[PDB]
Write an enzyme that holds these catalytic residues in place. Structure first.
Site, PDB file in Angstrom:
ATOM      1  N   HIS A 112       0.807  -1.218   0.000  1.00  0.00           N
ATOM      2  CA  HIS A 112       0.000   0.000   0.000  1.00  0.00           C
ATOM      3  C   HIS A 112       0.842   1.271   0.000  1.00  0.00           C
ATOM      4  O   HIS A 112       0.296   2.359   0.217  1.00  0.00           O
ATOM      5  CB  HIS A 112      -1.005  -0.002   1.158  1.00  0.00           C
ATOM      6  N   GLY A 166       3.126   6.449  10.005  1.00  0.00           N
ATOM      7  CA  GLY A 166       4.478   6.302   9.516  1.00  0.00           C
ATOM      8  C   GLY A 166       5.218   5.093  10.042  1.00  0.00           C
ATOM      9  O   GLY A 166       6.392   4.907   9.697  1.00  0.00           O
ATOM     10  N   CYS A 181       4.315   2.012   9.358  1.00  0.00           N
ATOM     11  CA  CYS A 181       4.125   0.899   8.441  1.00  0.00           C
ATOM     12  C   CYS A 181       5.477   0.356   7.997  1.00  0.00           C
ATOM     13  O   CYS A 181       6.439   1.108   7.809  1.00  0.00           O
ATOM     14  CB  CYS A 181       3.330   1.356   7.219  1.00  0.00           C
TER      15      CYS A 181
END
Lengths: 306, 306
Positions: free
Chosen positions: A41, A143, A145
């Site tokens: 993503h 942030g 991820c």
């Protein structure tokens, strides 16, 4: 003596954390031998479709659209691939700090250490458990991820988790590094249910044994019973059913201090009808369920990782 | 999103851990630029623990006595001194993994991360706090001496603790990297119970704020309390006195949440006498005092409206 909520030394994982940027979206990536692993993503969450089409979002992208940064020095991308949720960015430079690793999927009740990273820079490390609802109760900010969870086997960082999204309940969901999401979750932004969470009985029994290793018994009484004499009790008190395989792995802890695993269940039953509230159970009042039997042995024996 | 007991990434500290052996005793050592810092008492002998004369024992020992191993490779000692509780072992090889470091002495109530090590290799990392009675509640087995506690500020490791001994009450005692114990402790065989552990009030107030920024506002504060009359009830409840300096450090959290420092103090009283009755403050039934206000702001970084 003592018993804390330990996490694995994160040194071997800190050297694998890079920064992946595609367009304006920037998250963390895992730099293994010559492949960078990050959630897919990162390629479609700039235009905010609420339903990205990852199958066609990647075909248009070329190698130069990505930007892998290993702290300071930029990395060249020489190929990209997608394994069902994750992006594999083939890089020209082999990570010299790659440790022995392996990809393994964990089951609910298993624990691992999370290394929270932002912009490729690790920030903190904590130990958590895979809840029965296939979610984790971690601490992630925007942030984070790409952060991963892992275990170690004498040198071997067995990666088992990668953070993808946060559920509305406040819990966090993610995938393994093969890509398959833990539980019925999709990397899209559609609202999804967290599920029914139950306290892990097998981990509670192991946690109660750790109290009698360093030494605080304080509850061992009341007519040891058999297996099925506790499953229905767990139904009322929101705990999960206790299986015999849970008893099987509770052997070594029972073969150290207690008489039998069956004896530990009976004392646990009274801990549900009654509360301590005057003397903590070795760490606190409420029962902790994020200690697998394998974690108690590791901490009580001082197992190291070279 | 979420709140957990995180510790700093231990990567930079693992590169400084070595194994120090002196004849028959083996513990850990901190390998900085060209000096290996390990607790003194490594030179002592079981038969001489009544009142060791470390200055006398240090003269009897030479550089060839100390066996320093950085994994499988031996480090040659070219000098040995003592800062009154630590053994500086001058070595010939400069550690290439030395990060930017500084020795800091923390006050009671401040938190830090501990990297437990055995035979020079790390076992685990966890977060703890220096209790008001100058002890820590950690998890250490035999051979953990030399394990250090530290903090990281964006490029630099702030060493603040080195493990020395375990008190009979289960808590642990240690020194700073300059060789000065925290509290009335010496490396001898006297009793040293250390007495009367006290709860940290400034930390628990911060922990109560953390629940506010995570969806827990049911501890409503009706009235207020000044600085002194708050201490009137904090002396019988065994709580650390609250000072205006503690209010100043709690300033940023007061502004971010909008709840004044004095207002939140009155909120605690409702949870004391009435107990829990099923009330869990976001992570447990009991109060947590191992989260400084800096830790809360660090983890759940909110915004302040002004």
């Amino acid at each position: 003596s003592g018993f804390r909520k330990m996490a694995f030394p994160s040194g071997k994982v800190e050297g694998c954390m890079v920064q992946v940027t595609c367009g304006t979206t920037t998250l963390n990536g895992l730099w293994l031998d010559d492949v960078v692993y990050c959630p897919r993503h990162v390629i479609s969450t700039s235009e905010d479709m609420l339903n990205p089409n990852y199958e066609d979002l990647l075909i248009r992208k070329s190698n130069h659209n990505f930007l892998v940064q290993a702290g300071n020095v930029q990395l060249r991308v020489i190929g990209h691939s997608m394994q069902n949720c994750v992006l594999k960015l083939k890089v020209d430079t082999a990570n010299p700090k790659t440790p022995k690793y392996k990809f393994v999927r964990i089951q609910p009740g298993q624990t691992f250490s999370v290394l929270a990273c932002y912009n490729g820079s690790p920030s903190g490390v904590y130990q958590c458990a895979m809840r029965p609802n296939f979610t984790i109760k971690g601490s992630f900010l925007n942030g984070s991820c790409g952060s991963v969870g892992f275990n170690i086997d004498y040198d071997c960082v067995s990666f088992c988790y990668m953070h993808h999204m946060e559920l509305p309940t406040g819990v966090h969901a993610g995938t393994d590094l093969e890509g398959n999401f833990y539980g019925p979750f999709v990397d899209r932004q559609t609202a999804q249910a967290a599920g029914t969470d139950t306290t892990i009985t097998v981990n509670v029994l192991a946690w109660l044994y750790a109290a009698v290793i360093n030494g605080d018994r304080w509850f061992l009484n009341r007519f040891t019973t058999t297996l099925n004499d506790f499953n229905l009790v767990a139904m009322k008190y929101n705990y999960e059913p206790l299986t015999q395989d849970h008893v099987d792995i509770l052997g070594p802890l029972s073969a150290q201090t207690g008489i039998a695993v069956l004896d530990m269940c009976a004392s646990l039953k009274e801990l549900l009808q009654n509360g301590m509230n005057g003397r903590t159970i070795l760490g606190s009042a409420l029962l902790e369920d994020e200690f697998t039997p394998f974690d108690v042995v590791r901490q009580c024996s001082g197992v190291t990782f070279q």
